[PDB]
């Protein structure tokens, strides 16, 4: 009945030294029934990454919508959109459905190509922006992720350390949530290379 907790899933994003990390679980369910163990929740439009938790039909719809909008942006502007601008675009697009919202918890992550500055942001379902220095959490195990991030995180982690911190934040949060898990993916993002890693986790 609660749309944000039918399908389940989580996204977490963290900043490090000259890098950002964004990670998500792979579960898609119908409440108790697990359906898919390959449902990725992180997408990218050029060098800007967007994670989306919540109702899966809206996750898919919004991905298709932001692909559409960022493609037109690029044709007109003659450059790829930046994380700060994309954040405002996500907020705008969510709030225009104020009284019939998409049931989602989006998370933006990326590095500004000009300034080199790491950037992360989170939103509620109607577009209120939370721009964080440290980390953003989203999904059915957001409380669990807040607990993990708030204790595990420290500022200015190197990419290969940040990988370990975000992975352990995701994995241990997911294992305390019935509707999250079934696999996980972690993106480590630097100014001009991005590494994607699939994690080994318990499959229950």
């Amino acid at each position: 009945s609660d749309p944000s907790s039918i399908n389940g899933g989580i996204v977490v994003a963290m900043t490090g030294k000259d890098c950002v990390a964004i990670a998500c679980d792979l579960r898609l369910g119908s409440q108790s029934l697990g359906v898919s163990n390959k449902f990725e929740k992180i997408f990218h439009y050029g060098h800007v990454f967007l994670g989306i938790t919540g109702l899966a039909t809206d996750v898919t719809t919004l991905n298709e919508m932001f692909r559409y909008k960022t493609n037109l942006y690029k044709l007109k502007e003659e450059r790829a959109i930046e994380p700060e601008t994309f954040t405002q675009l996500v907020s705008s697009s969510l709030y225009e459905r104020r009284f019939g919202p998409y049931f989602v918890g989006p998370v933006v992550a990326g590095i500004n190509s000009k300034s080199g500055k790491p950037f992360i942001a989170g939103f509620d379902l109607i577009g209120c922006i939370d721009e964080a220095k440290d980390f953003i959490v989203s999904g059915t195990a957001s409380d669990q992720l807040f607990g993990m991030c708030e204790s595990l995180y420290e500022p200015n982690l190197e990419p290969e350390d940040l990988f370990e911190t975000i992975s352990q934040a995701l994995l241990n949060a997911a294992d305390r949530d019935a509707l999250s898990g079934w696999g996980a993916v972690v993106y480590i993002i630097k100014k001009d290379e991005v590494v994607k890693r699939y994690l080994k986790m318990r499959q229950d």
């Binding site: 399908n7 898609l28 119908s30 029934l33 359906v35 898919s36 390959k38 449902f39 109702l55 899966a56 039909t57 898919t60 719809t61 019939g100």
Partner: protein
């Protein structure tokens, strides 16, 4: 409508769909085909609210057939499933939504690969090796988790499907009156008349 199953094997997709049509107290029919051919190499099975199921299926069928004539070309199973998902995703925020869940089984002639898509009434799409809608999956996914292999032949896929149907006939309360089975491969769509 009750049980719709799908299983993608090596070189084909097999869709099994129950034959019963029950209106409350009585079983009105025991030979109902809960499927439409969208294109020569793409089949869609469906289940959900009465009336909405067939209306939706035939509406999709007409649109894909219209595309085929206009371009003199068959859309890929992926493209058909994305079209179907968008229609359902548009539907869910309407005045009166389509309450229809579908499986789309297709053979992609370009990639020479079978493909099975599961889409629910909300517009939730997933590509799977095997799929089901409603209560069917509760019984059958544990079997398919155990016995499925990606390199199975069509005959092995049918034997695995018999085991799914036997389990449903043993443990489900409703008499769904057996299943019509259809195979989708490189040569097109054909019905297995003895099951």
């Amino acid at each position: 409508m009750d049980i719709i199953l799908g299983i993608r094997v090596q070189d084909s997709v097999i869709l099994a769909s129950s034959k019963a049509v029950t209106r409350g107290i009585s079983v009105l029919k025991d030979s109902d085909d809960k499927t439409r051919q969208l294109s020569p190499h793409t089949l869609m099975s469906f289940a959900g609210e009465a009336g909405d199921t067939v209306q939706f299926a035939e509406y999709i069928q007409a649109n894909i057939q219209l595309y085929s004539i206009r371009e003199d070309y068959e859309l890929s199973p992926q493209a058909v499933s994305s079209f179907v998902r968008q229609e359902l995703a548009k539907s869910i925020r309407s005045r009166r939504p389509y309450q229809v869940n579908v499986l789309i089984g297709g053979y992609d002639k370009k990639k020479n690969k079978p493909e099975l898509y599961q889409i629910d009434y909300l517009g939730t799409k997933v590509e799977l090796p095997y799929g089901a809608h409603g209560y069917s999956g509760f019984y059958t996914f544990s079997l398919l988790d155990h016995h499925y292999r990606p390199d199975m032949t069509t005959e092995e896929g049918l034997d695995l499907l018999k085991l799914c149907v036997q389990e449903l006939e043993k443990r489900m309360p409703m008499d769904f009156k057996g299943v019509i089975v259809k195979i989708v491969d490189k040569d097109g769509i054909r019905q297995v008349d003895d099951f």
